[PDB]
Nucleic acid binder design. Structure first.
Lengths: 250, 217
RNA sequence: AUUAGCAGUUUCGGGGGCGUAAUGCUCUCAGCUGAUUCUCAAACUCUGAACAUUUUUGGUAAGCAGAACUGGCGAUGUGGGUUGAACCAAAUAUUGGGAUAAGACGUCUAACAUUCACUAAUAGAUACCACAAAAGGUGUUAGUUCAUUAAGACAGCAGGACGGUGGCCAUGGAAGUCGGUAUCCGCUAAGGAGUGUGUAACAACUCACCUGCCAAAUGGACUAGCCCUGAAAAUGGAUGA
RNA sequence: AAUCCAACUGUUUAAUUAAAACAAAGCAUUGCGAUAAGCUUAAAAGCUUUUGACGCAAUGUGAUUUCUGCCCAGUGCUCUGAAUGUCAAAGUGAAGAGAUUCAACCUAGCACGGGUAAACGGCGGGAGUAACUAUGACUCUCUUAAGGUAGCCAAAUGCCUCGUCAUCUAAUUAGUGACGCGCAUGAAUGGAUCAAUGAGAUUCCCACUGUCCCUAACUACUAUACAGCGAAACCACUGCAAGGGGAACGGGCCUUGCAAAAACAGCGGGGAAAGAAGACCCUGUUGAGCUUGACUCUAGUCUGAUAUU
RNA sequence: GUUUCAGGUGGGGAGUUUGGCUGGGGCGGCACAUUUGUUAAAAGAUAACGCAAGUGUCCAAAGGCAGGCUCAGUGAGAACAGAAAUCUCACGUAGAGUAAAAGGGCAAAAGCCUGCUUGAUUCUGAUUUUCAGUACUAAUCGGAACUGGGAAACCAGGGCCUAUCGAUCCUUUAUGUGCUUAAAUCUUAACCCUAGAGGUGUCAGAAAAGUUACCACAGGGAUAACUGGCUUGUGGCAGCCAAGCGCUCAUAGCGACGCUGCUUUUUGAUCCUUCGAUGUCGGCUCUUCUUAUCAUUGUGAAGCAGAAUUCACAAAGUGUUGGAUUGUUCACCCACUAACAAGGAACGUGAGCUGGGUUUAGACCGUCGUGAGACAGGUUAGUUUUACCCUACUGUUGUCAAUUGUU
RNA sequence: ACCUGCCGCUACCAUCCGUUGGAUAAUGGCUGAACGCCUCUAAGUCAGAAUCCAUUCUAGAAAC
């Protein structure tokens, strides 16, 4: 050249790294961003079709191949077949853009599908309106993160829906089993707190009091009624959140 | 093929690698099924035979073979009744093709896993033939012949190299012509075994048809 | 290693009508065993071969890498292949005449005559060697098969191309012909319950099918020679010109 | 208009780097009461000491502010430690004619046991689990002791990555706010913020519109001639091109296109131009500088003994 | 204290190392010693990081020998007992077994079972295998001593055979009424003579860690990075066939499964040319070129009523944009437009540019590393020299001396 | 220095100017056989692109 030497750096980065941190040692595989994803959600093609290299590195970028001994130490296996598979299944993948987008979409769907229980119905129902939930998610400007789980996100979104504004929703039917004469007292107590229907009064028999309680703070609620009553008792539930009752503004 | 375009597996070279106790990653062949039509149909009931045969020694892929078979599969209602149809291929892709892969597909230069230890993983299963070895065969009744040759015609396109179609003078899957394969029935010295034939045993057997009579039933 | 049905079976596996499920009858499946066939195996064999070419290993392949035999550029050029380390001819003291070699013999450029076919293509023209394929072609040449034909043909044009009957279906209707099925007979040289066009559908025309005339050849199906199609890449352009 | 950094004032690479580097006060640690600390010298002898802890010597951090969470397992550093192991030379005994040989007793150090993390450093992996509704508070376990606390962040620290959401724009891989199971952030390895400052790095807006749309004008070295003024330059040969084959991009060879002295001023298309027996790269049984629980060594040192005594 | 010696400390310093092969080199693996099978082209011989496997051991028996017996498997019977226990008889030229790999060899055995033994003993001579006809490993044959087995012939140099290992020195062990210690002949003590073990795995034998982005040297195109050369897996592009899509309808328009191609505008494979240096990437600038025609023109199709598209041909004559973002081609939006089509030309163009990156010295962060330091990890700052030569080109003088009359 | 500012040079930062014949391509035909028909084709030939070549335009040959 002169002094002017075409380096253009070590060897091109252009594939999914799958970083497995076993025995405190990084082992990696040449695959593709999509292929690995496909493999790990059902589409079991071929082991060297999903892998652009059917061998294992320690640094895919720098072009370094691991010691057999290291593999043995870590995985208790020598054959690259098994090791490679392991890496594929339980190592840190690099998704594409497409895959990322898909993931995002999935998350979006499951913060309206989970919120379909606590759905945004118009003036009257028209009970589902799941499309409208989805629509609303980005009208408030929400970070639909794929790091966090769906349930957590659902919790977050309902709080925002309060300051949309269209009120928080999460109502079910708690059928409280209440024995002896304190049941009546309890009923009297909790009438301004939440709604009371399908009631009965009994001194020599259990009382099936059906209430309409918060569903996303339900366990806590359950805990603080028994204590109030004094005596131990049973208070059954549905599942988590249901759309049997009214979900217009409630 | 999938990893290759069949231009590197066009011509016969290197000694035969197979699905063995030395290979093992060897994939399953693209067809393990080789007959099409009435396999119950008799040696006698069908007396018409056409072959497909290469003129050049070439390695036909298993996929290719499959494709060929599923022309003649579909040329059957067009022919007229699957009842009047047999097929057997008579070329099974025993032999396996090697592929050292080029680890670089979007970038990254080896000179370390380049062409050193660069020995193929077996991918590809394939059949060798020569300058006349059969590659499809069709037994049938004497009704369909312009039909079967057209199926073959389709098959011809699905195969590498210059093929050829010859009508045998036999009854289809038999070593006797017709001049012979009436004399066997006519004289009545034939012995039947379903799709095949046997013939009685005089110059076939002698040491075991010396003091024997059960050998003329 | 591995495909195909066939046979004798199976209260020894299982399910159907009969029978105790049946393995008994009548069907299929499963397993065993007997007779045959498909394809076959570098690491198998009952058996067995006298850098250039031939063999061969890896490789998608490379002017890649790697072996075998022999041959070649090393004290080896000359003549030839337009030109050229490997191809041929063939070995190099200095000469003359001769006759050949390889290769040429329009002109380049020493070297011509004849004779027969082929091609009509911006084609094609000195192995190596500087590219061409599968598949197409009513281009022309050669050729092979079987068929039609003096009961008169081909090609053409002229005439006829009917009835039971709107067969049964579907269907106001679809009558040969939205579409489907069975698809039979009468009379005739002659006519499919019909090849298409067309009609809401019938019809009409056209075909199959039959005769008139002209007057002797005709029809298909392949086969391989040259030519064409395929056949696009980068300064202007190379059968060497 | 704001972000990153460094506080500043200051300083530096004797010919590419003035920087965010260095420095710096402020904060902290250790050493040390004279025959001390630290260091210099073969030797003798010295310096800090024109000294005495409100100090000297050695480190780290780096102004202020607000903080510095846990770990002595490892490595280092220390110890009036248990030990009653190992333990050299000397000396002691035994044995053997002797040479010599074999026993105890046994220093420091190592081994051992405690101390120490503003010394180096580290601050998880798996089960459940705050309706796994869950970010992982909490429990249980495993190693290598502890298991990332407060802060902070796609930051100059984030591969995936143009991360997601938000703004700024007509349009933004740029910036900035937010989010943050953080490839691989984080508390004097100092963490967090920030006034003042900055030939500092980034952005955005106003900002005098020849950078550009698209150039022009004009004013100044060239050209000419005079002198000193084809110095230096040059150096296989030379210099017309198209394909070909050729150690595989020929100016020479093959075959083609073509061409007619001598010159001028510009041009940078070529001469695989010129400037260095390439430093990138790899080979040499070729070296250096530095490192370290390489191999070997050594001053210095700590301990033991003889002798002076 | 001072000598004088000894033990530890001792990268504060001293000197020196730091394998080899290798489709660049390191990461990798061992193909570095040896075995079998194939590679191996019917003696031998015959390579790669060629393929499938093995070796550093294991055995008082898993050695020697003699005698007896017959295994794997299957059939038919038989309290418990059936798919399995054990007991018969049938068939069984081996389908078993034989330390292990694989191939071979083997039935009055080479297997199993018994019995007795320790030829897994020593001296000496020859050979083979590899080969230099050197060593060693291994193996073979013949003798002499001494033993063993069995009547006896016979067999017995370890394992049925092909692998299961190692110089000199220096030690250490055995051997001998051994030799030698050269001024008293003795005593040891030592050395020798003879034969073994200690082990070198890089295996005919380099006591032996790192790094250098502060580096240096002799060299190398034998050996990488840009270029060109082959190639075309991969990239793009093109066909051929026609199951299907397409209301109907294979081919208007597509076209599965499958096959043949071109291409050198992707990248790899490669290492032929260049390391006594072709100035690496991008963007500006500019010509020219190719067509695989985006527009244009002239046409032919359509599932073409029109407009609007879609497909085909001739055709490269002319056109093929302004920005935002990014070092940037590539990329990714906005914006106009007839269209914003693909490319080439030493990945056109550094004595045309800036240097944005990349590629040195300074630094920062992260990660890794005991550390010196590393990072196709980011970050920031970091001299683009020479034409006055030859040509080619731009324009300009001069010549046209046989462009014929002194012109 | 500033405001004017001539000649001059210059700005799609101004103005004026950039043609027409044959030859073909694809393609559409015509007559028309090979092959009594039939066919744009074989003989023969009609139309016909930004094409081709001329016309127009720059230079003007060791050319007259």
């Amino acid at each position: 050249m002169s002094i002017f030497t075409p380096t253009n750096q070590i060897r091109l980065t252009n594939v999914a790294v799958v970083r497995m941190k076993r025995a405190g040692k990084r082992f990696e595989i040449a695959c593709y961003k999509n292929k690995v994803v496909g493999w790990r959600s059902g589409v079991e093609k071929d082991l060297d079709e999903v892998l652009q290299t059917h061998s294992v590195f320690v640094n895919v970028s720098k072009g370094q191949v691991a010691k057999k001994e290291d593999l043995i130490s870590a995985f208790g296996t020598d054959d690259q077949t098994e090791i490679c598979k392991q890496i594929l299944t339980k190592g840190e993948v690099q998704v594409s853009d497409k895959e990322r987008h898909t993931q995002l979409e999935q998350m979006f769907r499951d913060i309206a599908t989970i919120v379909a229980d606590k759905c945004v119905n118009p003036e009257t129902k028209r009970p589902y309106t799941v499309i409208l939930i989805e629509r609303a998610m980005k009208d408030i400007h929400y970070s639909v993160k794929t790091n966090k789980s769906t349930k957590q996100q659902a919790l977050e979104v309902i709080k925002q829906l309060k300051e949309k504004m269209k009120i928080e929703r999460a109502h079910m039917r708690l059928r409280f089993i209440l024995p002896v004469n304190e049941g009546k007292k309890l009923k009297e107590k909790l009438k301004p707190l939440i709604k009371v229907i399908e009631s009965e009064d009994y001194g020599q028999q259990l009382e099936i009091v059906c209430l309409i309680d918060p569903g996303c703070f339900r366990e806590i609620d359950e805990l603080i009624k028994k204590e109030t009553k004094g005596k131990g008792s049973l208070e059954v539930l549905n599942l988590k959140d249901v759309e049997e009752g009214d979900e217009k503004f409630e | 093929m999938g990893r290759r375009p069949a231009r590197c597996y066009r011509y016969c070279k290197n000694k035969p690698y197979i699905k063995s106790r030395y290979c093992r990653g060897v994939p399953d062949a693209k067809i393990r099924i080789f007959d099409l039509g009435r396999k119950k149909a008799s040696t006698d009931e069908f007396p018409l035979c056409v072959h497909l045969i290469s003129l050049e020694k070439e390695q036909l892929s298993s996929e290719a073979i499959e494709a060929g078979r599923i022309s003649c599969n579909k040329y059957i209602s067009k022919t007229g009744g699957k009842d009047s149809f047999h097929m057997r291929v008579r070329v099974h892709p025993w032999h396996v093709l090697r592929i050292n892969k080029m680890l670089s597909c979007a970038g990254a230069d080896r000179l370390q896993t380049g062409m050193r230890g660069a020995f193929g993983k077996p991918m590809g299963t394939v059949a060798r033939v020569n300058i006349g070895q059969i590659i499809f065969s069709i037994r049938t009744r004497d009704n369909m012949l312009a039909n079967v040759v057209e199926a073959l015609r389709r098959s011809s396109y699905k195969f590498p190299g210059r093929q050829k179609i010859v009508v045998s003078k036999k009854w289809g899957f038999t070593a006797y012509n017709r001049e012979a394969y009436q004399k066997l029935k006519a004289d009545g010295r034939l012995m039947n075994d379903g799709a095949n034939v046997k013939v009685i045993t005089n110059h076939g057997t002698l040491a075991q048809y010396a003091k024997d009579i059960a050998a003329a039933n």
